[PDB]
Ligand binder design. Structure first.
Ligand SMILES: [Mg+2]
Ligand SMILES: [Zn+2]
Lengths: 1320, 653
DNA sequence: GTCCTATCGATCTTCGGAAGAGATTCAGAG
DNA sequence: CTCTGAATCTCTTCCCGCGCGCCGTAGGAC
């Protein structure tokens, strides 16, 4: 057994029992391997930019009769890396270069070119790149593309009751949904006439398509219907009985011959009669003329002699018609079999709607129904009809759509073309008619086998296609008209349409979300959201219980708990922990192979429609350490049904008890106990915790923290193994070991940590070291904590000591009462960093300046600016302080002032300048910083190679060919001028001194390039001269009104900040830190929070025994004994750990991190039994009831009965109150109508909205209302007369008439509608 | 308007008029230059099709756009509907002198107060503050007083605490379904930043305290203060508008405390002695000499208001408990002690409070309600009424009840395994076997909770009502009655599929114990349905209330008595057998339509237009009356309104 | 690079809203 | 031959507050 060097510092005591056979996949492979799938070229041309190019090129005009064609593409390295790009505020992007070859043919000749011109990689655009954290950077702002989930291409059959006609019956419908191009709907009319339409246009008679494919009705009838024949021999019109065509229906008429009668008139027909029908060989039989007089004919019948019609396919027969046509010599008359149950006549019925004659008349009807007002025309019509279904420019089932289609038509194969074909539509019709004949089933729409995930590497491939589609339309014309003589490919194309397409996508699409960089969980659970909304999806306002609800295939694929309750429940889901995207995009999830009777430890991923074909055991099911099930019969799910089945009947097993959830819920301990309301609100509140100041560890967790904090990319992780060379909380630098070094390198990995910086939500993000100088580290160890982490565990909140009890009502209803001790400790203080910016311009009156020489202001304000016109770093500032002394010509003091209300310390400034514009000493101050920071880190390589190279001189001197009359005092390349002879050592000296010079020249260009990065200005917007951004850090504390939450979806405002003496304290005199209310636990059934408290209490107790054993100077062998006795506690828990191997050093180093509570894991559905919590509390010296008697610090009286006390984990949420408290006396008003502005970002007035006005009207209160909506609001006179009457204290109003109502009058009178006020 | 740098905001109409005027410039040209019919029919079409845009863009074949297919908002799009003047700016509009904050509970408030932050009061009341600094002559005028407020000088608070000293401020949450959703309170100043609201009133707002923001408005004029104090002040609104039922209905912790205070425990310290009054009952409690729920006898006095309305005071021994003696001290002097002499719970105390309003009236009732609140909080504190997992009680018969029912389900299965029962019958009987198990588990668990308390009566054990923590909360009506405790420790029971059809194998577990993965996953088909319903419903409910006020708003009570003799007839609603509502629900407080006779003949009982107030409806309940004819607003023959008598009792008064 | 003039007058606006009601379109017949 | 039934089309409605976040005419000709 082994633990990595960052595990072996706080080995979380694990209570899990099921052995985790599959370790959690890298939590963002959803995203990264999607974008990698876009960006890689791939000669198997599907997927990626290359697939899109090969979707358009080769490209040509017929009249140009020449082409240009895509050869290959290259993607250059990005002009600025992520860190610098996120400073400079551009987007992190890469230049796209494409080998286009233009080919010039000739007339008359064979096509052999007159010339062709490979343009040496024409520039095509700048595609953004994904950062390894899975995020794009789009205008310095960091953005995330959520995966979409939408209806896969294919064919889908559907039906409903009551939603249509409601006379008990149901109507059936088929759709073909291509990936790109037109939708085709087939549907029956109630009277089972069949109809078709494109793109939800008008309804058409369905055979109009078969007509359009030029089947005659005779052929259609041979495609759809079974034949029944009459042979006019042995007697007039004998009949071809196929026996099985009579079963269950009544023999209402005479059928007999030759010996035993099968079934006489009026009786059902059955098997024994059919067998007698077979044994008599009923190949022809006598039937009454009423039977033939029922028929509809199959085939066309002219009279050959007159040459003229008597009957036609699907025309209906009668005795006299039969007589004349058989009399005309047509001795075989042929018709259809149409039993109403099994063979309904729907296509013949459709031929009774049909207005068409034949192909052309249908194409006429198509073109007139689709493009009303354009002329139909034989040469023109096909340029509609073919581009509906048969042409690549406008119809495309991708490979997934073809697969799904073929699977539903039960085809043998799935390598198929993306267009339809005649037989491809006909098969849909046949399958739809089988459904109406009752012999088939409709698909469940909302099934994760019918909806597939699209992620970034596919949405961007489509938007890039829209680009190439608009270049198609330009380049075809330019090629067709062009001379082909001077044009080269970089004339043929230009980037602007591609760049528009892809930049608008990544910038502004409904799915290019601005990342919730709130804390490391919220980064991740956002990068793996599954969204039903957006382009090609549904809409949040326009769906109902059919899709919001969970479905049985969600299990293991989508988390049922973690969805953002509100107007879009379940239109957003979170992709479950273990789930994965299949090749095609369907969600698939891993299961264990059950081989005969033993659970084999191999995992097969199952998609949602493989799963229904097996029976799959629930993850809890026990096994015998050989791996046979222990239970003789076991719970499994099967076909959405679940029940018990035999041992060795079951065929797959779940991989882990965590498989059903997302990371967002998988982090709740004891989730096994909570109402799924309160699980949901928990798993939504964890992603809102703001990173507190001094974050640590949850004492009770699930062991998922060790993964969320690492995979979220925000802790800095050791890229290669080695030893820590230096640390200073800004840099960490690692001497990588030679077993993982690359041979020419210096061999030294710096990590410049990010310090105090705004998150996208204004919380700070300073990384801090966890290493010590000279400490060893191994690849993948956490070197530095992120925000909200410590030692690499996720740590959103603080393990506050809580007791559950009423307290004089301060924790009524939900509220949290808090002791002053928590605020004094800086437990929940949090740092909020704002960014304020002053732009400056080349305006129409002339160019602005930044200066201290501001007009109309004296040193009373300017004392905080430097001499340049920017605030000093470390200035502490408040409302109205001038941060940046901008001024405008013709001079106007327009300068950046700190907005009202806010306050903070100015932690940093940045300065950006156009080209050809002068700097200033705060630009030179920033240059001095950044230059020096680049140069230092470069020197720490050049120094290391210089030292190595002079050793490489010294050693091969000192070992042999010594010249050491004096040695180390000398400049170690002046060592060359010593008198060594022209034996090889002097030539080694000369060569290695040339290697030393070239080592200098190497950095002599590397530092020049770096300084050239810093020396330059930046790509400002048009009009601006320069911009400066100034950052205010605020250390906000905690106060009444702030919100805190547990993990269990318990939440409250904190209501009072009680002084320590008022907190309850125990029989040992320690006060409780928080007092939660009890009644929320039964009333909202989230009792898992109690077991977290008790297990938390035990967690404190073990640290309590350890801390005592470190204050007392216990020897390690006794201390190790107690720690070991803690890890081995409980049943056959999964984990094993041997402090015997920890070398004493690391036992003390471990104890020094347990000494405030042993951290515990309670994996989600696999937790501690109660009997193991008691066992831990007994190992501490604690009361196993979990409860303690408490006393009230207001009197020292005892409380009656003990109360729960223990260490809950509590999160401060980002809804803290000073960010919401607001009030307005008077200020701005809007221009169009004079009502007040609305906001906090503007000094706004609260909306006395519509419902409040009914509320006043429902008291008698008329004067209040009159005021509220005029004098206080709108009447431009009355409010200034009111204000003066109030300062005069007159308490009287003059109410007038609101100017917004006069706006209405003019806006009506701006129609030709004379509205007017009237007098009497 | 210009925006960020030298760019005009795309100001839609000016793009529409621009279309028109361009087209008109061309059409004047091509008319005067005398173009042929086909050309002028072109421009004339394009002009008509442009003025079409300017009036009501998008009633055309397609709305015209100037961006990524954003339709430009035309005039008629400015008038109508949810973003247009009538709803957006006329009917309700933003207002000055307002602010908002997170509310938080303030237990010490008297019912009429709320605390609001000094920062807000100072930024809200500014006009009134200047109206004192000039009146002190301490500031020269606005120009100085503005600065003197900005500097936040030491005087200003003593001025503020004179400005505000009794100026009602209006607090309302949003949405605000009903009149009780805006109320006025006298403010009291606070150091923090939250609005301290009164505990009992949070229920009216449906203000939970979990971070639920609330807006405040100052009324400016004298008339707005007189309306606020007379009508909207919380003391004037103890009743619902909708039904004769209090809205001050006690907060869960208050009723928990009063339940705990008034129980009897058959063994206690100081049990069985005899006392001369509540005051020495309290000395006995507070010194720790008697336990609060100990049995005792006390001398009591109580008061009754006679047939005239004047007090008769009476005195007796009473047999009771220490805590019922202490609680009697809070009741105003006119109620009978028989209302307190019982272990109180949420229904029992609501009627307590209601009877106070019945007998004394409003002004004592609001103070009595305040005292109840303070009392309940204080004894609920001493009670230490915690919750703890050792207090979840599982009846061990549960194990047998499953192990029995499982085989009987398998009997239904074995018949099915022999074809001996139909595919419908197998299912619809199995789910009834699970129901028969579930009722038994629930019944055994409620018996076990009551069973957990038994104690020595100085010799031999005897049982009493269980002090088990979760059972106090159910049996008091604080929170979480039968349907919750059943799930916490009984069984979770049957669950339903998405299409409502029932699961063949229930959740026989409960949240004290673990759900396995499947039981949990099926559990979410419940809860996610219930959340989808909430988020989906909250639209249609609002569109319903809109349609209603916007049809009802034309009515006002406008005559005293329209003079009808017509009306409609009220009976208990008798259906499905028994009566689902009695007559005293329907008829109370309407006026009689016609003379109401004695059951029988010729004896009249109520004159023909008398309000049937409570003493009349109790009288009808003394009689064998079944049907009563009353006036109803549908029959009131007032034109353009309703007469008062036809409407009858005002429920809030 | 700036200023002025115009929109697919050589396509393709999205299927995944329901409803609920009206205006407007057609049966079986006196 | 069109008169009362019914049939397909479009129009209109869809909680209240609130807080962030960003993003914001183009193309051609002189
Ligand atoms: Mg709330
Ligand atoms: Zn009336």
């Amino acid at each position: 057994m082994v633990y990595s060097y960052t595990e072996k510092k706080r080995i979380r005591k694990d209570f899990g029992k099921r052995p985790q056979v599959l370790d959690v996949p890298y939590l963002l492979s959803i995203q990264l391997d999607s974008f990698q799938k876009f960006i890689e070229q791939d000669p198997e041309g599907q997927y990626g930019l290359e697939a899109a190019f090969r979707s358009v090129f080769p490209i040509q005009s017929y009249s140009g009769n020449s082409e240009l064609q895509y050869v290959s593409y290259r993607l250059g390295e990005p002009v600025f890396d992520v860190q610098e790009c996120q400073i400079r505020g551009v987007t992190y992007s890469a230049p796209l270069r494409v080998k286009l070859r233009l080919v010039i043919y000739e007339r008359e000749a064979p096509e052999g070119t007159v010339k062709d011109i490979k343009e040496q990689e024409v520039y095509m655009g700048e595609i953004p790149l994904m950062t390894d954290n899975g995020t794009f950077v789009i205008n310095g702002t960091e953005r995330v593309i959520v995966s979409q989930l939408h209806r896969s291409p294919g064919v889908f059959f559907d039906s409903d009751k009551g939603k249509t006609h409601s006379s008990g019956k149901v109507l059936y419908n088929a759709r073909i949904i291509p990936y790109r191009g037109s939708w085709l709907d087939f549907e029956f009319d109630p009277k089972d006439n069949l109809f078709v339409r494109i793109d939800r246009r008008r309804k058409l008679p369905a055979t109009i398509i078969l007509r359009a494919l030029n089947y005659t009705t005779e052929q259609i009838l041979d495609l759809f219907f079974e034949k029944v024949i009459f042979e006019i021999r042995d007697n007039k019109l004998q009949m071809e009985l196929v026996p099985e065509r009579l079963r269950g229906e009544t023999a209402s008429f005479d059928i007999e011959a030759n010996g035993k009668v099968y079934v006489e008139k009026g009786r059902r027909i059955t098997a024994r009669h059919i067998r007698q029908l077979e044994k008599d060989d009923v190949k022809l039989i006598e039937v009454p003329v009423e039977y033939i007089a029922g028929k509809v004919v199959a085939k066309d019948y002219i009279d050959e002699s007159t040459g003229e019609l008597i009957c036609a396919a699907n025309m209906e027969l009668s005795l006299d018609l039969l007589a004349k046509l058989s009399q005309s010599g047509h001795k075989r008359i042929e018709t259809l079999f149409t039993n109403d149950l099994d063979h309904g006549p729907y296509i013949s019925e459709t031929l009774r709607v049909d207005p068409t004659n034949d192909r052309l008349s249908a194409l006429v009807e198509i073109y007139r129904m689709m493009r009303p007002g354009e002329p139909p025309t034989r040469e023109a019509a096909e340029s509609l009809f073919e581009n509906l279904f048969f042409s690549e420019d406008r119809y495309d089932l991708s490979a997934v759509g073809r697969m799904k289609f073929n699977r539903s038509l039960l085809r043998e194969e799935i390598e198929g073309s993306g267009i339809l074909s005649k037989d491809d539509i006909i098969d849909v019709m046949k399958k739809l008619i089988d459904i109406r004949n009752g012999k088939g089933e409709v698909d469940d729409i909302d099934h994760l086998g019918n909806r597939r995930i699209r992620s970034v590497g596919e949405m961007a491939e489509n938007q890039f296609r829209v680009g190439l589609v608009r270049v198609e339309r330009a380049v075809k014309e330019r090629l067709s008209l062009g001379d082909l003589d001077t044009l080269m490919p970089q004339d043929m194309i230009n980037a602007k349409p591609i760049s528009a397409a892809v930049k608008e996508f990544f910038g502004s699409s409904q799915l290019s979300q601005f990342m919730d960089q709130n804390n490391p969980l919220s980064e991740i659970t956002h990068k793996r959201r599954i969204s039903a909304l957006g382009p090609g999806g549904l809409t949040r306002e326009r769906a109902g219980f059919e899709v919001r609800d969970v479905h049985p295939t969600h299990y293991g694929r989508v988390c049922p708990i973690e969805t953002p309750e509100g107007p879009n429940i379940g239109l957003i889901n979170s992709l479950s922990v273990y789930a994965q995207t299949n090749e095609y995009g369907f969600l698939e999830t891993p299961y264990r192979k059950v081989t005969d009777g033993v659970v084999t430890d191999e995992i097969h991923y199952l998609s949602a429609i493989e799963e229904g074909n097996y029976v799959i055991a629930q993850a809890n099911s026990n096994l015998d350490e050989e791996g046979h099930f222990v239970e003789d019969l076991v719970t499994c799910r099967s076909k959405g049904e679940s029940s018990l089945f035999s041992r060795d009947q079951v065929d797959y097993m779940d991989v882990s008890t965590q498989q059903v959830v997302s990371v967002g819920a998988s982090l709740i301990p004891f989730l096994e106990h909570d109402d799924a309301n309160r699980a949901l609100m928990g798993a939504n509140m964890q992603r809102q915790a703001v990173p507190t100041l001094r974050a640590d560890k949850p004492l009770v967790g699930t062991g998922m923290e060790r993964a969320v904090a690492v995979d979220s990319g925000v802790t800095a992780v050791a890229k290669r193994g080695g030893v820590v060379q230096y640390v200073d909380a800004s840099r960490i630098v690692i001497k990588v070991n030679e077993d993982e070094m690359y041979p020419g390198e210096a061999g030294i990995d710096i990590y410049n940590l990010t310090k105090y910086t705004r998150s996208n939500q204004n919380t700070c993000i300073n990384q801090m070291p966890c290493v010590s100088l000279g400490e060893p580290v191994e690849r993948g160890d956490v070197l530095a904590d992120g925000p909200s982490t410590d030692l690499g565990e996720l740590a959103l909140g603080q393990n506050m000591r809580v007791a559950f009890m009423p307290w004089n009502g301060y924790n009524f209803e939900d509220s949290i009462l808090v002791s002053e001790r928590v605020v004094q400790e800086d437990r929940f203080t949090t740092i909020h960093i704002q960014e304020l910016a002053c732009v400056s311009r080349d305006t129409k009156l002339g160019p602005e300046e930044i200066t201290a020489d501001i007009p109309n202001v004296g040193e009373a304000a300017l004392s905080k600016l430097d001499e340049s016109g920017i605030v000093y770093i470390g200035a502490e500032v408040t409302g109205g302080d001038i941060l940046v002394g901008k001024v405008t010509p013709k001079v106007k003091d327009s300068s950046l002032r700190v907005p009202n209300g806010v306050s903070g310390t100015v932690i940093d400034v940045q300065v950006f300048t156009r080209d050809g514009v002068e700097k200033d000493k705060r630009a030179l101050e920033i240059e001095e910083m950044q230059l020096k920071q680049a140069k230092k880190d470069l020197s720490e390589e050049l120094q290391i190679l210089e030292a190595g190279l002079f050793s490489r001189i010294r050693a091969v001197l000192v070992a042999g060919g010594v010249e050491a009359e004096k040695l180390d005092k000398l400049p170690r390349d002046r060592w060359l001028e010593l008198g060594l002879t022209d034996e090889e050592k002097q030539n080694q000296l000369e060569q290695l001194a040339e290697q030393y010079d070239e080592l200098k020249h190497e950095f002599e260009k590397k530092l020049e390039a770096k300084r050239r990065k810093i020396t330059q200005g930046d790509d400002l917007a048009p009009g601006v001269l320069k911009i400066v951004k100034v950052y205010l850090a605020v250390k906000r504390r905690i106060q009444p009104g702030d919100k805190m939450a547990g993990r269990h979806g318990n939440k409250g405002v904190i209501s009072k900040i009680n002084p320590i003496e008022d907190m309850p304290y125990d029989e040992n005199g320690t006060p409780v830190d928080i007092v939660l209310n009890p009644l929320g636990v039964p009333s909202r059934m989230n009792i898992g929070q109690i077991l977290e408290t008790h297990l938390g209490m035990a967690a404190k107790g073990i640290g309590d025994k350890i801390n005592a054993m470190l204050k007392q100077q216990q020897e390690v062998a006794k201390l190790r004994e107690f720690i070991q006795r803690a890890y081995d506690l409980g049943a056959d828990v999964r984990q094993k750990v041997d402090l015997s191997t920890f070398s004493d050093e690391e036992v003390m180093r471990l104890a020094e991190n347990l000494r405030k509570g042993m951290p515990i894991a309670t994996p989600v559905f696999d937790g501690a039994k109660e009997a193991e919590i008691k066992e831990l509390l007994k190992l501490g010296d604690l009361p196993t009831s979990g409860q303690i008697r408490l006393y009230d610090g207001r009197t020292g009286e005892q409380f009656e009965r003990p109360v729960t006390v223990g260490y809950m984990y509590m999160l401060k949420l980002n809804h803290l109150v000073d960010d919401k408290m607001h009030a307005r006396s008077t200020g701005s008003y809007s221009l169009v109508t004079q009502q007040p502005l609305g906001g906090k970002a503007q000094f706004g007035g609260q909306r006395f909205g519509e419902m409040e006005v009914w509320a006043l009207e429902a008291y008698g209160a008329a004067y209040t209302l009159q005021e509220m909506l005029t004098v206080k609001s709108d009447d431009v006179n009355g409010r200034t007369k009111m204000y003066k009457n109030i300062v005069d204290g007159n308490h009287q109003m003059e109410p007038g008439m609101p100017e917004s109502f006069n706006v209405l009058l003019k806006e009506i009178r701006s129609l030709g509608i004379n509205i007017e006020l009237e007098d009497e | 308007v210009p925006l960020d740098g030298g760019r005009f905001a795309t100001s839609d109409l000016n793009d529409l008029y621009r279309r028109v005027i361009n087209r008109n410039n061309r059409l004047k040209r091509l008319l005067d230059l005398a173009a042929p019919d086909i050309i002028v029919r072109n421009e004339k079409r394009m002009l008509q099709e442009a003025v079409d845009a300017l009036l009501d863009n998008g009633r055309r074949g397609r709305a015209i756009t100037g961006s990524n297919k954003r339709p430009l908002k035309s005039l008629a799009d400015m008038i109508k509907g949810k973003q247009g003047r009538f709803r957006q700016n006329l009917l309700g509009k933003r207002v000055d002198y307002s602010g908002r904050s997170v509310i938080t509970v303030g237990p010490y408030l008297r019912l009429h107060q709320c605390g609001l932050p000094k920062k807000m009061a100072l930024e809200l009341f500014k006009p009134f503050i200047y109206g004192k600094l000039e009146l002190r002559g301490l500031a020269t005028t606005i120009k100085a007083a503005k600065k003197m407020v900005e500097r936040e000088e030491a005087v200003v608070w003593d001025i503020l605490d004179e400005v505000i000293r009794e100026h009602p401020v209006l607090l309302n949450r949003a949405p605000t379904l009903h009149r009780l959703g805006i109320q006025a309170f006298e403010p009291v100043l606070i150091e923090g930043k939250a609005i301290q609201l009164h505990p009992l009133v949070c229920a009216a707002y449906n203000a939970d305290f979990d971070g639920d923001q609330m807006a405040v408005h100052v009324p400016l004029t004298l008339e707005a203060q007189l309306e606020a104090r007379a009508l909207m002040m919380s003391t004037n609104n103890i009743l619902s508008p909708a039904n004769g039922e209090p809205i001050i209905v006690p907060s869960q912790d208050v009723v928990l405390g009063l339940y705990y205070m008034t129980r009897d425990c058959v063994n206690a310290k100081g049990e069985g002695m005899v006392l001369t009054g509540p005051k020495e009952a309290e000395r006995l409690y507070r010194s720790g000499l008697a336990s609060l729920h100990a049995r005792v006898k006390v001398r009591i006095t109580e008061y009754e208001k006679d047939a005239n309305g004047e007090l008769v005071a009476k005195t007796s021994l009473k047999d009771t408990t220490v805590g019922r003696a202490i609680l009697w001290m809070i009741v105003p002097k006119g109620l009978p002690y028989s209302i307190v002499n019982q272990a109180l719970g949420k229904k029992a105390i609501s009627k307590m409070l209601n009877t106070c309003y019945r007998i004394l009236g409003l002004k004592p009732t609001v103070i009595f309600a305040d005292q109840i609140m303070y009392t309940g909080f204080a004894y609920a504190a001493r009670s230490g009424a915690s919750v703890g997992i050792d207090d979840m009680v599982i009846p061990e018969k549960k194990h047998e009840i499953i192990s029995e029912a499982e085989a009987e389900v398998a009997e239904i299965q074995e018949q099915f395994q022999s074809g001996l029962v139909t595919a419908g019958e197998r299912y619809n009987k199995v789910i009834d076997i699970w129901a028969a198990a579930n009722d038994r588990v629930s019944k055994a668990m409620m018996d076990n909770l009551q069973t957990e308390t038994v104690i020595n009566r100085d010799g031999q054990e005897e049982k009493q009502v269980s002090f088990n923590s979760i059972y106090m909360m159910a049996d008091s009506g604080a929170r979480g009655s039968a349907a919750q405790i059943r799930q916490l420790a009984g069984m979770r029971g049957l669950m339903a599929k998405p299409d409502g059809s029932i699961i063949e194998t229930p959740i026989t577990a409960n949240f004290r114990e673990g759900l396995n993965v499947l039981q949990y996953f099926i559990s979410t088909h419940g809860a996610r349905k219930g959340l989808a319903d909430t988020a989906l419903k909250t639209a249609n409910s609002g569109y319903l209330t809109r349609r209603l006020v916007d049809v009802a708003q034309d009515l006002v009570v406008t005559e005293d008595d329209c003079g009808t003799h017509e009306g409609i007839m009220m009976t208990p609603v008798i259906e499905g057998g028994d009566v689902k509502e009695p007559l005293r629900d329907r008829v109370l407080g309407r006026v009689t339509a016609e003379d109401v006779l004695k059951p029988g003949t010729a004896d009249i009982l109520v004159p023909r237009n008398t309000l049937l107030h409570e003493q009349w409806c109790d009288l009808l309940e003394e009689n064998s009356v079944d049907a009563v004819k009353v006036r109803s607003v549908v029959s009131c023959d007032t034109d353009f309104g309703v007469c008062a008598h036809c409407y009858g009792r005002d429920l809030a008064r």
